[PDB]
Enzyme design. Structure first.
Site, PDB file in Angstrom:
ATOM      1  CG  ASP B  90      -1.931   1.062   1.252  1.00  0.00           C
ATOM      2  OD1 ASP B  90      -2.046   1.834   0.281  1.00  0.00           O
ATOM      3  OD2 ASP B  90      -2.660   1.188   2.260  1.00  0.00           O
ATOM      4  CE  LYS B  92      -3.441   5.281   0.731  1.00  0.00           C
ATOM      5  NZ  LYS B  92      -3.266   4.011   1.475  1.00  0.00           N
ATOM      6  CG  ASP B  95       7.129  12.028  -7.325  1.00  0.00           C
ATOM      7  OD1 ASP B  95       7.224  12.936  -8.198  1.00  0.00           O
ATOM      8  OD2 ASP B  95       7.762  12.067  -6.237  1.00  0.00           O
TER       9      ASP B  95
END
Ligand SMILES: NC(=O)c1[nH]nc([C@@H]2O[C@H](COP(=O)(O)O)[C@@H](O)[C@H]2O)c1O
Ligand SMILES: NC(=O)c1[nH]nc([C@@H]2O[C@H](COP(=O)(O)O)[C@@H](O)[C@H]2O)c1O
EC number: 2.4.2.10
Lengths: 257, 257
Positions: B90, B92, B95
């Protein structure tokens, strides 16, 4: 009317990390943040030492360092202190508050132990800031909120940008500014740092888009340029950093009058 | 008309990672993803072994493990294979595409080497997916897009959610579904995984909000529940996992007819 970096360092509501940054920007005549996008610790440290006098800030992605250790970050701190620049870990925290608190303080990286600044996306709501500040306030750190992005298809526009500004201005004890393409706040206490910067027009093959230092500092009113490949890919990284420093600094001076 | 997990596993456009997941969900009668939110490797692995038969997926935050090594992830893989569950890091990613490519493949964590699934925020535009896919496709991996968030003040709503759905539906060779609170796509090839789940009403003190398995799987039409503290903080984590498994599975069965 626009205040100099040195005068902004004295503003009543200025955060201590912002004031330290603004003072060294003024002292050293640099508003350049080096994006030290390398995978080797030795290259990171050699760049930090050689370019330290040219920069106000060194931005890391320590999760791309193949040979990260906390000792590397101790050596980086030595250089940051010697040359006078801040360390900004570009982690883009973006989880619920309970999770980011642990991601900031703990794990292998212990980011809060060495990073003066970190950043966060605003998408989770203000709990992302509250979770980070639980760790960052006692450690005297600051945070930047990502209000806009430089990449193609960015959703950080309109009301999303406005929400980032509101979130920053309501957490001013910890949030010291923005990652943005332009000035997004009319409060001079807040910093604006702008990535997606190169001297020439263009982009990369994965959605990055560039604007010039004159465009983003002059016309768009930002404070600091963040530059990665424009410097890192050059043969002489020191001369490239100086080119970017002069471009950003002149642009600031000309905007100031 | 709604298809079972087993039939969805056979859909023409199904991703191989989604098909593997759906198969094992049907075989084991579980649509529970354990959020293994612990800081010790030993506890992670003891939970993975004991709860492995109860779960379709184990979600990690390896950046919170105090004693992460790649050998820990090798042992986690052994358990995932034995008990038949997928590993979801996880992370996330959030960028620009060029950066996330390196964060996924490299650094100390080498996430792509051990994670079946990762997730990404859509805020940077589709370059975030294109960067991940340049590592994930050759490594046969899948990705989930964060279309909604469970936390107070979430900005992942309205046109932002729709943009996530469009981005997924346009990168279907790699994106296998969503992190969301509700069904967001009407294409049955996509998985919906929902965090912010506990049996009782409530929340945390950093903006997390909870809904029940019956609400999320039944009324809101999601596929999988992601549960952290509801299980991890319980005295008997195996009994808790079973409670959550039965709740989510029966909600699915009742929605199916
Ligand atoms: N928020 C944004 O809009 C945003 N755009 N780029 C970056 C980061 O800034 C750096 C840009 O790198 P280079 O293109 O080489 O100048 C890189 O580390 C990237 O991850 C960033 O935070
Ligand atoms: N809406 C979202 O996208 C979202 N909400 N929570 C999580 C993650 O799922 C877990 C929720 O944890 P617990 O509250 O203890 O059940 C935790 O790891 C958190 O980081 C998440 O990805």
């Amino acid at each position: 009317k626009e205040l100099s970096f040195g005068a902004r360092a004295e503003l009543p509501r200025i955060h201590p990390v912002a004031s330290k940054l603004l003072r060294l920007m003024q002292k050293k005549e640099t508003n350049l943040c080096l994006s030290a996008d390398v995978s080797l610790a030795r290259e990171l440290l050699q760049l930090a030492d050689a370019l330290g006098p040219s920069i106000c800030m060194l931005k890391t992605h320590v999760d791309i360092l193949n040979d990260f250790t906390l000792d590397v970050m101790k050596e980086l701190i030595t250089l940051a202190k010697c040359h006078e620049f801040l360390i900004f870990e570009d982690r883009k925290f973006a989880d619920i508050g309970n999770t980011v608190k642990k991601q900031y303080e703990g794990g292998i990286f212990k980011i809060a132990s060495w990073a003066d600044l970190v950043n966060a996306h605003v998408v989770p709501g203000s709990g992302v800031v509250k979770g980070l500040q639980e760790v960052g306030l006692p450690l005297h750190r600051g945070c930047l909120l990502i209000a806009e992005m430089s990449s193609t298809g960015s959703l950080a526009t309109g009301d999303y940008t406005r929400a980032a500004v509101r979130m920053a201005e309501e957490h001013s004890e910890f949030v010291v500014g923005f990652i943005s393409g332009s000035r997004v706040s009319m409060k001079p206490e807040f910093l604006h740092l702008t990535p997606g910067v190169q001297l020439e027009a263009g982009g990369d093959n994965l959605g990055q888009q560039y604007n010039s230092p004159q465009e983003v500092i002059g016309k768009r009113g930002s404070d600091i340029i963040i530059v990665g490949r424009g410097i890192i890919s050059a043969a002489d990284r020191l001369e490239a950093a100086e080119m970017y420093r002069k471009a950003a600094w002149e642009a600031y001076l000309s905007r100031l009058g």
